[PDB]
Amino acid sequence: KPIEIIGAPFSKGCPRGGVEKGPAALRKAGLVEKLKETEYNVRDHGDLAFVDVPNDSPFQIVKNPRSVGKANEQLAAVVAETQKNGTISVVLGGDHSMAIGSISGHARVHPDLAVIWVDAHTDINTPLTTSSGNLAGQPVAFLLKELKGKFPDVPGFSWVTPAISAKDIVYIGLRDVDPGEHYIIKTLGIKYFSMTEVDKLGIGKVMEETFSYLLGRKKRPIHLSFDVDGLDPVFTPATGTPVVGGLSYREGLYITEEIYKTGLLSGLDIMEVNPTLGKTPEEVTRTVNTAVALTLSAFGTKREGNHKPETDYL
Ligand SMILES: [Mn+2]
Ligand SMILES: [Mn+2]
């Protein structure tokens, strides 16, 4: 099964800049080369070039609506294209607003996909509930069928068509949810494992329940959207919205190892690595290293070890 790396150096999803440098930082560590050592064939699509929309005025409180909408429409096309050729798409973030295009394009080919969203945040604010207007905090609102018509049509997103229902997504790692967002996830009956549930059950039981919920009735493609801020800031400090009390490095790898074992990974997003936000060079190395480790883990690298078949090592 082939892999296609797609860079999304974009940061208009938030006011802070820097996350657009994420793809470069990840590639610098040798991510592409390391992936080629797994049992997957790897193709690098390179980084997408995003055309900035001039005079991109704010739609009400929403910032950079047209630019974000355009970047995501382009990403959606690329991902849909790769999915059509039966390859696994891997999007290297910039900001999480890019999940709109990544998941939308993925859903065009696999409408029955299930989403596992690892994040400290729900990123489900709507243009009407957001207090900042940052689209990086509203991705899920543009993807859910249940929220269609719950907010005004935003300039640059008419191409969007709600990909999944609130019942096809599972959140893991939540600990910084706005009131409006909490109201939404409760009202919509969305399945989630906040840090409270992770502490209660243990990451082992969390994954067990996550798969039983999403795959119990039918096996289907999995789209893993991973926000590095889902892990505690002591592991992934170089990110824009760090929140204390997060998933450990170990828990993060456990998630990816279990997802690899399902053999259902169809799409993956590695988002929010902002190289300009490390307080030191090492904080960046630390963040990039775990983002890289998570990616390789999603593709077969196991902590117990690995070895190539049909090879008598002795
Ligand atoms: Mn996020
Ligand atoms: Mn986040």
Bound molecules: manganese (II) ion
* Strand residue percentage: 5-15%
| CATH homologous superfamily caption | Ureohydrolase domain
What is the ordering of alpha helices and beta strands?
EHHEHEHEHEHEHHEHEH
Shape: globular
Q: Can you give the helix content as a percent range?
A: 25-40%
Q: Give the spatial strand order of the biggest sheet.
A: 2-1-3-8-7-4-5-6
Helix count equals 10
User: How many domains make up the 3D coordinates?
Assistant: 1
Gyration radius, in Å: 18 Å
The biggest beta sheet is recorded as: 8 strands, parallel
CATH class: Alpha Beta
Number of strands: 8
Q: How would you classify the helix and strand content by structural class?
A: alpha/beta
* CATH-assigned fold name: Arginase, Chain A
First CA to last CA: what distance?
Answer: 29 Å
CATH architecture: 3-Layer(aba) Sandwich
Modified residues (Phosphothreonine): 276
Modified residues (Phosphoserine): 57, 67, 158, 212
Family: Belongs to the arginase family.
Pfam families: Arginase
Overall description:
Its EC number is 3.5.3.1. Homotrimer. Interacts with CMTM6. Pathway: Nitrogen metabolism; urea cycle; L-ornithine and urea from L-arginine: step 1/1. The protein is an alpha/beta fold and 314 residues long. The protein has helices spanning 22-28, 31-35, 65-84, 99-109, 139-143, 179-187, 195-201, 203-215, 249-262, 281-298; strands spanning 3-8, 42-47, 88-93, 114-118, 169-172, 191-193, 222-227, 265-271. An eight-stranded parallel β-sheet has the order 2-1-3-8-7-4-5-6, with helices on both faces. Strand 7 (222-227), helix 9 and strand 8 (265-271) form a beta-alpha-beta unit. Helix 3 runs parallel beside helix 4, helix 7 packs across helix 8 and helix 9 packs parallel to helix 10. The longest helix is centred in the first third of the chain and has 20 residues, at 65-84. The chain starts with a strand and ends in a 16-residue tail after the last helix. It binds manganese (II) ion (MN) (2 copies). One manganese (II) ion (MN) binds at residues 119-121, 227, 229, 241.
